[PDB]
Amino acid sequence: MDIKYKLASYRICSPEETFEKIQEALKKIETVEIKNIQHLDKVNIPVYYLKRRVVVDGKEGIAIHYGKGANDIQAKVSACMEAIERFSASYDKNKVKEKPDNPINVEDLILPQYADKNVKEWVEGIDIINNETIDVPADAVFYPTSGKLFRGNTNGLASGNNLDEAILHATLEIIERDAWSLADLARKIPTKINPEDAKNPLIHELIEKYEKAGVKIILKDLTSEFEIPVVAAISDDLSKNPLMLCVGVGCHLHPEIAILRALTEVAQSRASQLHGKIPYERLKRIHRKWFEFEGEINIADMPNNARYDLKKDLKFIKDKLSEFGFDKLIYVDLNKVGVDAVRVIIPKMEVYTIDRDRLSRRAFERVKKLYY
Ligand SMILES: Nc1ncnc2c1ncn2[C@@H]1O[C@H](COP(=O)(O)OP(=O)(O)OP(=O)(O)O)[C@@H](O)[C@H]1O
């Protein structure tokens, strides 16, 4: 049991501690400014940004990274670790191989129609389900990319206090996007979550902050086959302020953490929007799918498989993925500035919600089993 589940984080140490440990990497990534932007939105949910110096081609400028959380420290750490994760993903001429000994079938990654399957640059990764090395396309690992195999994305990029922690987060993200992808294909999302029985009072606190600012919040269950809670927080802003509909999605072994991460996601999208009208018929479509519901469950009804131990958590996931024919769980260590940072790749997991050009022929069948 190496996980401190205090308040709203599920990490090996407190966010305060993490913030302390990362100061040097913060200087290495060239951070200019770390600003709280909680009071940009009427909801008063902690959201931060980090700006950092970045040179593209020859032109220097600024890159921004947001962070979210149920308290200030979490959100500040979140923006920092978000920034480190991104910096660490750049492209590393020393991690690339040209004649791979063990190349993955690129087809398994789910390829767009325009995919250049003639992959020149590979990267050695570790399949932790099969305890083997496996070579994966650089396009699947780094960000940003040329986009030859597929359009570059950040799905599966995570940083963390140690490697396992980074791996767990990235795995939960992959699961989240896969489940959301299936949700995107469903005609209706029928099951509402009633959060009243939450042991963690931060859930009630976050709903209230939404209600008091005139934002209705509805929680929907998007959990897939793996019994790893995936939750959508659907927000409708009925105030004078210019935002309306949001939707943020959270995933975790603990259903309550999934819920919190969904709530804080909405918070982050709102603030990043604010740092800057749906036609009837579309609104009607959105109402029927995202707002209406058939059934309602309690948090108590949802699976909870968190064992508050990284090894036990990963074991559970590895086994669950494996059980359901998702037979590889691949990571690539992307540490650059002395903080843990990974790419996780789980072949066959959908990414459609992030890249509409990528959808496998298995998605339909999975949608029918899970929904109708
Ligand atoms: N307390 C923490 N300790 C170590 N790493 C953290 C901590 N909080 C966040 N991170 C890392 O920073 C990155 C951003 O985390 P966060 O949960 O805010 O965003 P996310 O889950 O990527 O969702 P989104 O970016 O869509 O808002 C992730 O790589 C995460 O693992």
Task: Supply the DSSP string of 305-318, one letter for each residue.
Answer: ---S-HHHHHHHHH
Q: Ligand 1: which residue has its CA nearest to atom 1?
A: 15
Resolution of the coordinates, Å: 2.3
**How many other C-beta atoms are found inside a 10 Å radius of the C-beta of residue 198?**
20
Q: Whose CA is nearest to atom 27 of ligand 1?
A: 265
- CA pair distance 95, 87, nearest whole angstrom: 15
List Cβ<8 Å contacts ≥24 apart for 139-144: 140/109, 140/343, 140/345, 141/89, 141/95, 141/332, 141/334, 141/343, 141/345, 142/89, 142/90, 142/91, 142/92, 142/343, 143/86, 143/89, 143/90, 144/91
Cβ 244 vs Cβ 237: under 8 Å? yes
Q: Is the CB of 171 under 6 A from ligand 1?
A: no
Number of other residues whose CB lies within 10 A of the CB of residue 16: 12
Distance 158 CA to ligand 1 centre (A): 7
Distance CA 291, CA 12 (A): 37
Question: How many Å lie between the centroid of ligand 1 and the Cα of residue 189?
Answer: 27
SS (H, E, C) 135-157: EEEHHHCCCCCCCCCCCCCCCCE
Question: Pairing mode, if any, of strands 157-160 and 191-194?
Answer: unpaired
Closest CA to 331 of 118, 95, 120: 95
d(CA 192, CA 56): 45
Q: 155 C-alpha vs ligand 1 centroid, how far in Å? A: 12
181 lines ligand 1 (CB under 6 A): no
Q: Which of 19, 50, 159 to mutate to test the pocket of ligand 1 (most atoms within 8 A of CB)?
A: 159
| Determination technique used | X-ray
Residue nearest to atom 28 of ligand 1 (CA): 158
Cβ–ligand 1 contact at 264 (below 6 Å): no
Termini Cα distance of the chain: 39
CA of 81 to the centre of ligand 1 (A): 6
Q: Is 332 in the pocket of ligand 1 (CB under 6 A)?
A: no
Q: Collapsing DSSP states into helix, strand and coil, what is residue 194? A: strand
Q: How far is the CA of 19 from the centre of ligand 1 (A)?
A: 13
CA dist., res. 314 & res. 325, Å (int): 17
Alpha-carbon distance values, 307 to 160, 254, 310 (Å): 18, 9, 8
Which residue numbers come right before each break in the chain (C to N over 2.5 Å)?
Answer: 276
Strand ordering across the sheet containing 215-221: 248-251, 230-237, 215-221, 191-194, 295-298
Contact 263/217 with Cβ under 8 angstroms?
Answer: yes
Which residue's alpha carbon is nearest to atom 4 within ligand 1? 160
Q: Residue whose CA is closest, atom 14 of ligand 1?
A: 82
Q: Decide if 61 contacts 52 (C-beta within 8 A).
A: no
Q: Which atom of ligand 1 is nearest to the CA of 81?
A: 12
Is residue 328 lining ligand 1, measured as CB closer than 6 Å? no
Atom of ligand 1 nearest to the CA of 173: 21
Q: Which atom in ligand 1 lies closest to the alpha carbon of residue 9?
A: 1
Neighbour tally for 71: CB within 10 Å: 15
CA torsion through residues 271, 274, 276, 282, sign: positive
Contact 171, 317 (CB under 8 A): yes
